[PDB]
Structure 1
Amino acid sequence: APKAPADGLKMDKTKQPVVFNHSTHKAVKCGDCHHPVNGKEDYQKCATAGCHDNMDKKDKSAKGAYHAMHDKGTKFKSCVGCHLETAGADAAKKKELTGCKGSKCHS
């Protein structure tokens, strides 16, 4: 089995880098994030060539990196999509977990 890496991982393909902590996500199954591709959970970096390697933040294809982290209605819950469900009607949690600035993802 692949092992979860250390906390403090920087996602840094963009000018708005974000820190990802596996430990705060330990209740989520690994494969919900490292989702199947060709029938096998894929543990490569999300923006690997052929994966979410389209760095145009308006792209909505399966290659759009922004889309994969921010949008609702995706085949796997995105970072923002899952956080919206988690926050519910709690506006303070919405700001913390889904805000575009001054949130836990973006300062």
Structure 2
Amino acid sequence: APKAPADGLKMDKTKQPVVFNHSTHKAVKCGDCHHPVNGKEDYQKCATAGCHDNMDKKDKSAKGYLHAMHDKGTKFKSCVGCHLETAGADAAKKKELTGCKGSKCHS
């Protein structure tokens, strides 16, 4: 159980970096994102060696970095997956939280 970093955290493993703010996700349990690995919630960087370290856009295994941030039907809600539920039928929120362009993730 480490300490939540300050906002402005830059996820920049790709050419479309995204800023993650812990403050806006205060209502979400730490473990929902820093999920269990070998029985214990893991707080290492998502793309740590052995984790989601493959940058291949088509890798849908546990090694797929982009898969972990965008896809639905995953064991743990991904960024987009959780945002889809949050936005519901609200088209404005869907654009803001799940859009591939013109969203708060990818301008």
Q: TM-score under structure 2 normalisation? A: 0.99
For residues 1-57 of structure 1, give each alpha carbon's deviation from its aligned partner in whole angstroms, at most 9, with x where no partner exists. 311000000000000000000000000000000000000000000000000001101
- How many residues align structurally? 107
CA RMSD of aligned residues (A): 0.5
Q: Distance between the aligned counterparts of 2:86 and 2:58, measured in 1? A: 25
Q: Distance between the aligned counterparts of 2:66 and 2:57, measured in 1? A: 5
Structure 2: segments with no counterpart, 5+ residues: none
Identity of aligned residues (%): 98
Q: TM-score under structure 1 normalisation? A: 0.99
CA positional deviation for 1:79: 0.1
For residues 55-81 of structure 1, give each alpha carbon's deviation from its aligned partner in whole angstroms, at most 9, with x where no partner exists. 101110000001000000000000000
